[model samples]
Target: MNLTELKNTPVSELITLGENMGLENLARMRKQDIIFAILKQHAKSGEDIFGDGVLEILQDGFGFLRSADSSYLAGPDDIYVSPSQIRRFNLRTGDTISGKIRPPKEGERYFALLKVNEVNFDKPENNKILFENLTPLHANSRLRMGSTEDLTARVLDLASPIGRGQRGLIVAPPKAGKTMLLQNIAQSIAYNHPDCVLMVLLIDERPEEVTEMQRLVKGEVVASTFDEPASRHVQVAEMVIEKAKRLVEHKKDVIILLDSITRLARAYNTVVPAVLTGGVDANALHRPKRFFGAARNVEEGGSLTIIATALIDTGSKMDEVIYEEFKGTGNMELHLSRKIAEKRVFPAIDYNRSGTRKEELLTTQEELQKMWILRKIIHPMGEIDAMEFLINKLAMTKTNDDFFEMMK
Candidate 1:
């Protein structure tokens, strides 16, 4: 309706409309205010004054009101949010909230979450089957990536093998390719287990790395920036973890990879606690514990493996949280030396510094015997010494399956 006609419209008509639409605030408002807002909103586009959608929080600390009427996202369903709305609202995953909506402005597609009235928790089935069936991770199961045929898997199977439900750390100094190594592992999942669900929570990394990972891996991706608060980033991470756990209830296998969770932990102290600076201490562990504690292998259901990175500290040390992240045989730790990286070590993985305790349970007698024979010469060797050892060892090799072919 034209503003000229709307200006002449009666307060009774506007109030009747509000009552019919079931808008509490608009119904309570007087005629002039309702007409003014409606006229102003109509000036832009005649889109509905009120609309409802499911609130899905993105990897970044932003909200999108997914259109309720759209299926297959056939129309403009996404409603974008501002930075403060998340923290202000204390938003969570797949919450159904209703608010005022308008047509896209100059270059908008989905309606801006602006002039947004309010939000609330609407339904229970936003996640019909969440982790309500939580159970113990199977102890009898052996976590294997793919097969001995894949080069990366073969090398990792014998050297720092990842159990199906293990919690692993890829720690390194700057420019040491921790993210790159994680990328390789994700790539392996794509080529081999096409059916596996790969969820990557890229928390507090470069925008380049964030986009790069999405292109590299074929799966669900959740990305966040340093701009977001630690509380929200961690919440996004927990949301993803919960989704992964729920997937296991359906007997679907899942693996989540996170880059530089170090920044995420710090975001907590800075944003939530307001105590940002200082080296790692006992008190620091409490914040990150809730996030890492979610990584587990389910005995009654499927498995979930979490392989995340620890950003290197100035002293070449990582967070003390690493020491407590995993139990007896559930962890695989790797340290990438920046010194050796300049020497052009591809992975820069310290063989002696990295090993897995769970592989013994998964690897057969011959695989164990074969792997140790090579690790013996390589382990405890320097970057230069390890390189030379592999070179000479490869030349003298007379048998197969020495973990040499995979390295080459």
Candidate 2:
């Protein structure tokens, strides 16, 4: 059998050839043997099959043949196919298909070949556009307090503004009104986006947060809290993912709000490396032990959006002392004093110390550009730097030598 002969052989003839070769149970044969058998039965010369339109049947116990150009058969490139084309071909794992090589045209230097296989028409295409357009607004979407008269107006925004699958985060200090913020947002969504479902996954927090949220909101809100010996932080995250998966399976658009990610991370044993090389393990790095996968929308059905808050200790010696050391001693003291005076406290959202992987997912390209511009305008100084600057200003005004000496 050679290439030229194989090109001329019909599909029926190929099947007959396989049967004649003691390949009555071709599916039981190895893949390489199947390829060899198909080639031996059809080809008159290997070179004739070298260019294109070569068919290889699966030796495995599955129906379907593969078609690819000679280059793919001979070359080292792994099989590649477009998703839509894959769907169009009714392709399956054990199936085989025929392939043809396309001759090079103008400016073309090599042959291009494609594998033809079967695809299932029932499989739906991923509908990213649909998810993008399904924005439902909630009360927390606009950052309004719970007592604001515009609360009704804010709630109205959630009626159709926030989409079923949209994800958002409620970020603030422990006592800085995070629960109230989340409750306001939930209430807006419950009253407005009745079509969408919302869920709250509590980590190492009081059960009261969940109760308060449910009491304030109007729609269906499922809450889960962990308080057992085995109810660790990582378990909470895993449970949240599991619950989100169930919601998606039921064709429900889900918004998952994790009140605080920081506690979860801490519970999962996230640790910052010690600085100054003071007998501490230098090789140790602060890395998240576990992380939830990114939210995704299904092509034909619902979507899952996850919003989690990670607690970070900006007051850590490494983050505050070593990093802010250059600001001088007097400045550091004054900075701490002012925080006490205003009750602003430390770790007041040092943006430089924080970042998000999905920042672009929630904001527009234009909005991202504006953010970059704003970052540039702030120049060489982020929130942390500003704090240092303020500290330095106070130290200079007070002329506190004790503060300066302590920093030294």
Candidate 3:
């Protein structure tokens, strides 16, 4: 390992490595002494000290270097890359890197990268634009999810079109088939838009539901089930978004399908209590809002589309707070109805309440007028009949004024 990488390694980790290599007085030694002892051990171990692999950054800021063949899970041959090393090099997930590594020390799980030689087969770039500095822009293009066979897709296309970088929310109460709708949406996007990367994050979800989501959804599932600690839930939820942000910076379109914001907010509060920051305990809304606000479309690069679920207002103060804080976050909202779901409707999307701000961008003026007229016609009907009529009507008609006149 070079002197710079050695200096970048945490002193505590170096101490641990020194102790494991039979060096005494490591705890009392200077940082240079610890590094020297570790280097001595590395020299004694001979020429097999370097390894090549893929990097996976974690929420804790440190990362693991897994075998190139195995992308997701950790294994014995994996190397632990320190947070300092990651920051020093600006390393991101899925970057193929070759580096020198030290064998696992006492109380450690994997080998650690002592120095990085190459990232993605070349020397890492310097002074590159960071993802944080990218300008966030409004979504200019609509995301076409599915074709005529999908009723929910048809309704969403004609009524509330989700844009490429639109921040969408599925606002509904319990038993509204919110999970099912999200699964369908994920599958449709996967089928129709094969180029986009879909990340499905489920925070505080049930074990069976997590498995089902992984099975049904045609994308990667990052789940922190309810049985896990609240801190872990927050970690998983936050990590996925951070990863998506990096991917977006790399000129990739990423869509994060978060199951519910309520549980995520609860997890945040559980781990760190909403303390009074700047007078009113606004810390409660600050983090959650920041989490949702990461969804955006950039001008020159790719987009990060967030289609998260938010629970309907229940009379509880937390519920009221979340509703008030999250109402304006999404440009498109698919408000579900438990009444319609009970009637065996698949999507259960309430036509009148669920709408998008970018309707004019997605459709022509004539189409928007037809959609407005259709909503008016279906507004007075019962829950089941309304969805049935709306779906059938939208399927049979396009943007013609005759359909709008007939509905009137």
Candidate 4:
């Protein structure tokens, strides 16, 4: 370790390390002196040092090694792994790596990896596959939401079941409980899929809502509040997606819960206005399309699932433009109603306007037939009353016949 790495470590830990090394008067030495003494000792020692950490790749091509207990954030003990080393090893982020580490050379500020002994608990030759060359495929399996105790998950399972890598869009007007539904989904996924990596990205959101999301979400909650500049919002959103991609490339299932996509588009417009470019800007649609389209399941590897929200009738022309542009992009569409929300319905999901594109892939024929009947019955009734009735009937009914008879 070098001066910078030693400085990042806690002073208490440094003092203890000094005491362990049998240094004299360590308690009397200042922090700088302790670091200097440690560095001097490290230089004098002849043996090579070894380190192990979880790899976190950055957009710039290089990466860092963080301790298993710590997160993606930088800490005092991070080891610098070079871009060339990562490329040569075909290493992806989130790989638990162990290797020989060399103390900082001339101008370097961090310890550098001299050789990789293991990648994700295996030899280097065994983990040579590249994520970029993997074949992409459509989502073919169901992503189990949760048990029936969760009304939102139950309704979604019965009506519009989500595929493992499906691009799901939650369209709603203001105060339509979209935020609540998203929160419930995040919580349910966390409980059900303990192995999946969950990330909640809040772009241009209220500060209070951001805090609440961090408290509720079991995974990473990266946010840019409304008070922040639009450039910062775009930057944070981009970084979150990049991190998700890296995790996905590491053969891990990743689910991203983006609070709203409309605001992201608005932020994009603020950063690069259409008027400034030309009379017409196709990039307005193309940019967000790339973000939404990134959700997919690989044929042999893992998946990237994006569940994003969009607001409608918010008195912004960009809202309608975004809605139109993204209408056909998502495989699952969940539309919410403000009228039902005003009546205090929890989820406020509008069955009439909500559906899954690939229903047959997710549910059996009998379930789909019964789901059609359920939608027909719930279409005209007050959503709150219909939801209550459906919940009650589902608990009592045994089979499709019983459900159909109850529908009668």
Candidate 5:
């Protein structure tokens, strides 16, 4: 009988089968004992029992190996290899590998890695190593204010409304309500979209902020603090993105709220030009695009929506290269201001600096036209400052500032 048939056979009968299979010593053992022995014997005797597959590394320093011929992945049904083991082999992503068969330890879903063997970097098809397909699709794309009917939501609806497959950036200075606003958007998506998978990868933020966000938002989180190496920072976030990509490939809508794409960009800054510690890299846009660019309406599958926050200066010239990329990449830019930050403003989103890409999906042409007219009138505080500068400097005094303040 086949392995399936033998496995299905009664354990009581398995003792006899063990004898027939020359596991005679096991025949005297309990039915369960003999069943286990039988499977091992079948594997040891050249039966196709042990699993053989190529490795796909994961974040957190573990990985899974997929089969060359079939989808049969072999590990202990746990995920990835051990950190120590991986370091021993000096393994990195997409290296060819294999291992022997084994039973799971106590409780695990996917196979665990042990005694990993290195194969050629490519294929092992037909008993020979060969080069196979390699390359990833780069789909460029395009927010949230967690739903609130208050003035905050109103401000977002008017100035920074976002929708499916859109990229959103919240730019502000320190203590400028960036994280607080990000938390709101994350919570809104988590609460509103019950079917989608919501995830937060706290990259290079404060550990406390990470914990705070994990508490408020519902999703798997991969958190890292500011002191981490740039490589570790990038690695953890990459892990989450790769996992989310797999879900999207399977028709699952994924919403990833990155608390600070700024830090992620900074982390990547250390990737090249080894001397640079923390600042903008020339190719900064490409890496973030690899991350946020993954946002799209996966027509063959499901959608991926990304919302990231970037800290910016008060001046027009954007400090972060990522911000300009986000703007150039069609992500809605919500340039928040420290000037309006306080207990009263609620949103503090600068209508003059912010705009949306998917406004048509969330609103209409006439409605946008009306918002265009009214948003200027409402947040026209900028105009008073400008008018004051022109009139006072060119034509008023510090004493004259009172009437402008009163008018404001």
Candidate 6:
């Protein structure tokens, strides 16, 4: 039967009609049978009518039923054409037409049938989820870009109040002093936030970089050299994740430093397939496969912060592969250029490409506003204007000396 004719049926008669049609177990019928049953039931009802019970029963198993008004279902067993069914005869949950149920094929006894009625459907109001009572930042909070004093001033900001979780991405090309920049930040976090515990994870690193991090941070530091063995990096990351999990469980604040994510990505590309395909999983990749999915989470009464570095190569095939894999998973991209480093006479940050998601959650709204305003004001002009603006802002504070020292 066509959709328009089916709309006038009732549920009670539909069940009876199904039995007469040799369709046993109405709930187990496929999409076509379900539609036929619905139509036959509606024919029993002389006039249009529906009961609260009918609405509840249909909606319970069919998402499409939720969208219908009183007029849609004529009587208690009345069958009506689902808006979703108009477009696609197959309807299911989230479809405009009602969803159907069916028995599973052999070996799968719990399977159910679903119909796709429409391309898009409205969701029920009660099912709409939301979050509330979120404030941008706490009072007396601020964000510091490069000033040590500004960093010091916001020492408390180091510990995330909502959860002791933190993540930062540092990106730059070779010789841009990216390693040194991260080292400085590590030192700052380690020394200033004594109340919080810190763990440094080195994936692929130059010997000197590892040494520098160990020498600077007083907190617990773990270093893994990617060149040593494939298993080494994976082991270190796994160990760090385990330790962080324990700390989180105990309500302790933990910060993890992933020296560089590029190395890990490289290791994954090289190791995952080989191991799964019966090839050697050398070096850091030798660890139990379970560790691959291990991740750190800040628990109640505790926090975990993750600071990682990522290499950005505009033309690297490896970079492209890794980007495609992680782009959709809340990965933040930071663009660092050699020009910024040259112009500042110190390690530079390319503000145009550097950004953080939930910027307000990580830093103060006022600081975000300032950055936004600065970006809008300078971006329209040129890099020179941006540099001048940054210099002016930096010169107004005692941190100017440190800035000059870095430049020199």
Model 5 scores a TM of 0.58
Using TM-score, give the best candidate's number: 3
TM-score of 4: 0.72
Ranking by TM-score: 3, 4, 1, 5, 6, 2
User: Which of the two, 1 or 4, has more TM-score?
Assistant: 4
Alpha-carbon runs more than 4 Å astray in model 6: 1-164, 274-299, 314-316, 331-334, 342-344, 361-371, 398-408
What would the TM-scores of all predictions be? Answer: 0.62, 0.37, 0.73, 0.72, 0.58, 0.51
Shift of residue 358 alpha carbon in model 3, Å: 2.9
lDDT of 1 by residue, 1-408 (tens): 222222233447645445554344763554434643443445455544555555666667776764322210213335566568666655555454556555555765455554444433332222323345454533345555522224434445556776666677777777775776777788777776776588888776667877787678788667776665556666566556655665665556778887766666655544444233344444565766656655666656667777777766535234444443433323677667677677776546666777876566656667677777767666456664564454444434433634546466
Model 6 over residues 321-349: C-alpha lDDT tens digits? Answer: 44333342322344456765665545255
For candidate 5, what's the RMSD?
A: 14.4
Task: Give all candidates' CA lDDT scores.
Answer: 0.58, 0.39, 0.69, 0.71, 0.56, 0.45
Residues 164-218, model 3: lDDT tens digits:
8778888888788778778778867988898888888888899899879877877
How high is the lDDT of residue 274 in model 5? 34
Error of 4 at 340 (Å): 0.9
Question: How far is 210's C-alpha from truth in model 3 (Å)?
Answer: 1.1
Per-residue alpha-carbon lDDT of candidate 4 for residues 31-73, written as tens digits (9 for 90 to 100):
5455546654665675666677767777799988755322233
**Best candidate, lDDT-wise?**
4
Error of 5 at 79 (Å): 3.7
lDDT of 5 by residue, 246-296 (tens): 556545577777867767776776676432313455665467668877776
lDDT order of candidates, best first? 4, 3, 1, 5, 6, 2
Q: What are the per-model numbers of colliding residue pairs?
A: 7, 42, 0, 0, 15, 33
TM-score of 6: 0.51
